[PDB]
Amino acid sequence: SSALFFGNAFIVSAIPIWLYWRIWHMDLIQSAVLYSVMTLVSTYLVAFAYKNVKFVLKHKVAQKREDAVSKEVTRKLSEADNRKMSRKEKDERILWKKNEVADYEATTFSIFYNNTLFLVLVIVASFFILKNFNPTVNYILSISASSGLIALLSTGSK
Template identity: 55%
Template sequence: MSNQRSTSRDEDLLLQDFSRNVTTKSRALFSGNAAVVSAIPLWLFWRIHQMDFSSYFIHFILGTIVSTYFLNLAYQNMKFILKHKIAQKREEAVNREISKIFASDKSANKKDKDDRVLTRKNEVADFEATTFSIFYNNAFYLVCLLVLSFFVLKNFSPTVNYLFSVALSTAMVFLFSTGQK
């Protein structure tokens, strides 16, 4: 019974590493970053496009909430795609790192070493995928927003410019994050 319970726990941990679920820490990091990046257009349209904040309060709040939600989903999608690629690329380096640790310990068996390598590889891949996902999606969102706002939709009214530039930027980031490659 104890061996079966241990195997089940090991399988659960392995499945958790390959699932789309994100940790609470990553979820909080994603939500915070998405909220900050979604609020950047508020300043842009308030100061540069001269939209009065009190007159367009509802537009700004709705645009920020929707943008935050979809950016958060884009972060999660991109992290899922990147995590496995990064884990494969970092496997050799992590293997060397763990081998150095276990080189002096003669009593350690191969299963312990393999478990340690898998755990460390997933930690490294999770961290790198999280940071790159945030960086990539933020950069892509802001570039799309600036191009749409200042070049594509510059002749439209500020309200239409805001709504379409935020919506299209968010949609593009979200759609590109759902890709498989």
């Protein structure tokens, strides 16, 4: 799970580089290091944001899965095995599997929410703020601001 989270964070932080790869194509032999370092720092910040958001939303997700918990209760109990089962282990196993699926769905939702928020302000920034500043500096600052806001929306400790 840690490895897949690592890879997902890196790929979602690198896909902006994927769309910025051939769109301008300025000195790749020298801009590759800049792209790598920005991707790494964005990956770290977005991973911190993902951890914070999943931790804060797990409280709601606990009761969000209650209907599915009861649905699995129905099947785990509607059997002659449940007539002479442990009568408690069933609850433990269904809680474990529902927690696992809840964590998976919550992480997916958070990752894609941050990804969707990533490509909202960057386009308008590159379209407008280039009037007075260098386009490359504008793209760099837009990416930095997007990463910072993605990190800050997690905790929100204003």
